[PDB]
């Protein structure tokens, strides 16, 4: 298989605008949302049909209860952070946890937090410790590191449980996640454009006379086209004072393409 990942996000907002949820949680497999919960619905629900079709109501009922609990815990933690920062107004709190199963069979795992969209605490599951970016985080670090069992628990979750969940979900969504739609690529400053491809991971570049020119190249973002596929571009400027061979190079899911201009 290609590299795949499972990530779960939380967002807490301390003084949200009317109607807007104080708490939102979304899980992803690769770029695909798979689950969602927020403080307005108070229900955990599938975001992909291949999640809905393979997980019974008791799964969603149980995680609905858990997320209701985790929502409250997030509120309490944010309240403590904003208290110790001595901040007024609305502030944000974020968590991201997840793992990757690499093509070569190796794994990664990660867990971190943010306050107002900036790194706050970062877990190291090898040294079993938290990296604190400032003194509010440093205080939380001491509290969280005080019981070793907590650290051991996250190491186990990240290295065993997360990867097991990922493999299970990969099988559920295989018709989506493991497919390949090759790109359609054209040249049109020279613009090289690709569209219609899946997975979104693609590498496009320009070479001049068989040499790459990285910092003369403008790299466009890989963007969702809305139909499950993606598009992207890269551009380069023409030297009108010299003749040069320009070629667009595209790599996508184990296939290389060259378009000579």
């Amino acid at each position: 298989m290609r590299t795949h990942s499972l990530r779960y996000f939380r967002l807490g907002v301390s003084d949200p605008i009317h109607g807007v949820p104080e708490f939102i949680s979304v899980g992803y497999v690769d770029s695909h949302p798979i689950t969602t919960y927020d403080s307005v619905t108070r229900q955990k629900e599938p975001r992909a049909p291949w999640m809905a079709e393979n997980l019974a109501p008791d799964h969603w009922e149980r995680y609905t209860q858990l997320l209701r609990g985790w929502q409250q815990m997030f509120k309490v933690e944010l309240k403590r952070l904003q208290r110790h920062y001595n901040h007024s107004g609305s502030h944000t709190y974020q968590r991201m946890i997840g793992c990757e199963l690499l093509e070569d069979g190796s794994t990664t795992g990660f867990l971190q937090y943010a306050y107002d969209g900036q790194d706050f605490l970062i877990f190291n599951k090898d040294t079993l410790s938290w990296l604190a970016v400032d003194n509010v985080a440093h205080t939380i670090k001491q509290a969280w590191e005080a019981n070793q069992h907590e650290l051991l628990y996250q190491k186990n979750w990240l290295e065993e449980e997360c990867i097991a969940w990922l493999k299970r979900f990969l099988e559920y969504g295989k018709d989506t996640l493991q497919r390949t739609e090759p790109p359609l690529v054209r040249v049109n400053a020279l613009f090289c454009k690709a569209h219609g491809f899946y997975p979104p991971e693609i590498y496009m570049t320009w070479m001049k006379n068989g040499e790459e020119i990285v910092q003369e190249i403008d790299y466009g973002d890989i963007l969702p086209s809305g139909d499950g596929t993606y598009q992207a571009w890269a551009s380069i400027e023409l030297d009108p004072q010299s003749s040069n061979l320009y070629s667009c190079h595209v790599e996508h899911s184990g296939v290389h393409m060259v378009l000579q201009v």
Partner: antibody
Amino acid sequence: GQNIDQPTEMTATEGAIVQINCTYQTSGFNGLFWYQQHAGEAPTFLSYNVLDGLEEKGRFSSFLSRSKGYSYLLLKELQMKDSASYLCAVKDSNYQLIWGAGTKLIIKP
Amino acid sequence: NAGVTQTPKFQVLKTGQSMTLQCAQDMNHNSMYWYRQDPGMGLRLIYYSASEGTTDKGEVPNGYNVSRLNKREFSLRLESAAPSQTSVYFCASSVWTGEGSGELFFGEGSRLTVLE
């Protein structure tokens, strides 16, 4: 997960050592707990393991092997006051506890 | 600083009679649980409450109901007692649920005997 097993009863002598076994088969694993419950009393937390190996706390140690789905609770220098039931419990993938039926430990003075 | 306080310690009931077991915890815990303990088997969860404002069934909810009255209190109701509900009931609480390595804190137990 779906089951957890531990011997119904064990008898050992005062001053000696006893090892209480617990095996489990679960859909996923998020930690193994041991609790002590004196007859007619409340269970109380004794130990937690979640990575592999042995952890010591006073006269008690608890061991875990995740790959074998196996834990033991080791009690050293047994005293009469160790007479109690010992409950093994495993947290499954959905963080739900699954409880062993308990091991009644009898101590001969 | 009393921990988990459940009542009553003992109760005899006639089949069909109603009964409420009380449980309070003063440890500022968020999660509460009701278990029954019977000979020859492990503790079985009846209902639980992951947080203030939510509850859900456990493994053996039939014949029972619960009310998470507030953050401190979680009551267990037997609307129409049956002989099979003869058991020892344990209230328990934890700081959170599904969150790390946190253990359970148990009440003293309530012994119920239901007779025809």
